[PDB]
């Protein structure tokens, strides 16, 4: 056939045609980095494998790029800042490399590698900032990397450096610029809801907003589990009881912010309880969830819990 007979002939012929060594290539190529030109095309093709779909290409690209310039975070110190200053000419550290490594990080899965990349962006113009915010919002669009990197029970200096670097580059952009691709403001609020580094740029990004479609679809959950009180106030100042019924079954909320949302749903029931009681369809589960969140932490809602319990038909048997 065209497959089985072809495979048999290919196995039988075994013709390789025109078919240690790493040291020779690395020390005959390290020279043209500091002396010559157009050898950077080989580096660009080498970095193209970082954008490839398969894991093994990115793994071998990282392994090969580790030693040609010369403890994974320590590898980042040895490879980002020690082998920074001038091995190539100034052309090879510009957007030719920067765009390639920007397309590398969209499918890149290793979190400290992404940390090293964003540190490299923070180290080093309007279109550069545009592409930087594009790739920043694109990698913030996936939340698993911030879930894995940023844990409130595991304070690490690497994550603090990462968030400080992102606050620095967003400081640079908001100083550059002072409907507008509004997802970027959602991205920047959802990483400033992490909290301050364990620096001063955090308060800058804090007070540039909150002047004392555009936001509400999915935001209030993540900017209520934030521990900063300004975002709690910004949450409580702009809602109506439909999203209160939406987030009443959301979990992860801490004790203080569940007390404020409990008092806000209390005053919402005090305003107009008929529409919110008609909107929901579960009664026993609703009473169950408000009771367990009542006795889980701070109470906050003693009267209106009884009001909503008495509005529904209560349990007839103990």
């Amino acid at each position: 056939h065209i497959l089985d007979q072809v495979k048999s002939l290919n196995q039988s012929l075994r013709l390789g045609h025109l078919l240690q060594l790493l040291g020779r290539l690395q020390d005959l190529l390290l020279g043209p980095k500091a002396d010559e030109q157009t050898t950077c095309e080989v580096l660009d093709y080498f970095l193209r494998r970082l954008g490839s779909s398969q894991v093994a290409s990115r793994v071998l690209a990282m392994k090969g790029l580790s030693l040609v310039l010369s403890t994974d975070v320590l590898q980042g110190y040895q490879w980002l800042l020690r082998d920074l200053p001038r091995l190539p000419l100034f052309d090879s550290v510009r957007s030719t490399t920067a765009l390639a490594l920007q397309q590398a990080i969209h499918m890149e899965t290793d979190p400290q590698t992404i940390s090293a990349y964003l540190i490299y962006l923070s180290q080093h113009q309007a279109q550069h900032s545009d592409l930087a915010l594009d790739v920043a919002r694109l990698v913030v669009e996936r939340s698993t990397i911030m879930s894995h990197l940023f844990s409130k029970l595991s304070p690490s200096a690497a994550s603090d450096a990462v968030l400080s670097a992102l606050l620095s580059i967003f400081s640079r952009y908001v100083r550059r610029m002072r409907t507008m691709h509004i997802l970027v403001v959602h991205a920047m609020v959802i990483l400033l809801t992490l909290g301050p580094p364990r620096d001063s740029e955090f308060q800058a990004l804090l007070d540039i907003w909150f002047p004392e479609l555009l936001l509400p679809d999915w935001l209030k959950l993540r900017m209520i589990r934030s521990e900063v009180l300004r975002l709690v106030d910004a949450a409580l100042q702009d809602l109506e009881p439909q999203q209160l019924l939406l987030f009443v079954q959301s979990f992860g909320i801490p004790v203080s912010s569940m007390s404020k949302l409990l008092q806000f749903l209390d005053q919402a029931v005090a305003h107009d309880p008929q529409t919110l009681e008609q909107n929901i369809m579960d009664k026993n589960y609703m009473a169950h969830l408000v009771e367990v969140q009542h006795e889980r932490g701070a109470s906050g809602g003693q009267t209106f819990h009884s009001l909503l319990t008495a509005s529904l038909p209560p349990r007839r048997d103990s």
Partner: peptide, 19 residues
């Protein structure tokens, strides 16, 4: 027991994805 088990799963942030 379900009332008591709803308490400790409420504080966990990752349970919303499971929900």
């Amino acid at each position: 027991d379900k009332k008591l088990i709803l308490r400790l799963l409420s504080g966990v942030e990752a349970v919303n994805s499971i929900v």
